[PDB]
Amino acid sequence: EPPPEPRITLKVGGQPVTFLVDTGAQHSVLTQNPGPLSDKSAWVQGATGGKRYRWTTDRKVHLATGKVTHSFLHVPDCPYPLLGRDLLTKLKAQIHFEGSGAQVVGPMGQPLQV
Amino acid sequence: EPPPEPRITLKVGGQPVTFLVDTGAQHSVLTQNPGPLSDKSAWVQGATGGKRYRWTTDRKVHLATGKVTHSFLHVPDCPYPLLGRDLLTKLKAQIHFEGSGAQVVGPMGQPLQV
Ligand SMILES: CC(C)[C@H](NC(=O)[C@H](C)NC(=O)OCc1ccccc1)C(=O)N[C@@H](Cc1ccccc1)[C@@H](O)[C@H](O)[C@H](Cc1ccccc1)NC(=O)[C@@H](NC(=O)[C@H](C)NC(=O)OCc1ccccc1)C(C)C
Ligand code: NA
């Protein structure tokens, strides 16, 4: 069962993750069997309350133009992974609701060759 | 208090409301001075938990694509209003990540701000 649109699949640590593309997330989120965790945590404020969640250690993430090293919040209270403004800035993504559904493309309108 | 980019100010119930444009919000949210409330409520799942919130009564929302009626979730636990997929679908918005921020444009590529 995929997250709602807009969504995108990126390779994280070598394997695909399908994210909800989330302009309301300050940083990107994993939710399940996230791999090695840092000892560090962040305070996460959600719509209904806040508490702390652990940072992953660094992950290799395949974007359209290159790999990047990036860390994620591990938030098992979230229903699916969230690709937030941290990674939307690196992708220079555009999100379009004026077509069929909501679609996510690259900086020149290109389906992200990711 | 003021939301990060991408953000947009809309007239809602005759007053300006500055929203975080939130592709991760299934429904749009008002946080302070929501106007009259209905006794209808909904369960909201946030990133860190869930809680029941009330719906506002109907508001006129002045979208660039034309004014419509919409009702909002009143979520006073949220730090700023959220413009979610329910209204982004009506606005047929595009959201463009460029530089360190993000801008909102209309269905025919007209900027809706700046
Ligand atoms: C994911 C978080 C990191 C994010 N929080 C933050 O960004 C805050 C301000 N930042 C912060 O915590 O900083 C972290 C940090 C620290 C150090 C370094 C870097 C980062 C967030 O909760 N963002 C949310 C918006 C928001 C923004 C600011 C403050 C509070 C909320 C949504 O975009 C985000 O997409 C969530 C993710 C999500 C998706 C699905 C489930 C649970 C959570 N959606 C939502 O919370 C919305 N829920 C939903 O869309 C759910 C799926 N549907 C729902 O409840 O249905 C309502 C319904 C009503 C009636 C009929 C049918 C349905 C909510 C606003 C309505
Ligand atoms: Na659409």
Contact assessment for residue B20 and residue B6, using Cβ atoms and an 8 Å cutoff:
yes
Q: Is B54 exposed, middle or buried (0-12, 13-18, 19+ CB in 10 A)?
A: middle
* Beta strands per DSSP E along chain A: 7-12, 15-21, 29-30, 37-45, 50-56, 59-63, 66-70, 73-74, 82-83, 94-96, 103-105
Going by C-alpha positions, the residue among B3, B13, B20 that lies closest to residue B82 is: B20
Q: What is the resolution of this structure in A?
A: 1.4
Secondary structure (DSSP) of B43-111: EEE-SS-EEEEEEE--EEEEETTEEEEE--EE-TTSSS-EE-HHHHHHHT-EEEEETTEEEEE-TTS-B
Interface test with B, best of A97, A104, A108 (most B CBs within 10 A): A97
* Domain B1-114 CATH assignment equals 2.40.70.10: yes
Atom of ligand 1 nearest to the CA of A24: 33
For the record, the structure tokens of A17 come out as: 């993750």
Chain A residue closest to B31 (CA)?
Answer: A47
d(CA A110, CA A33): 31
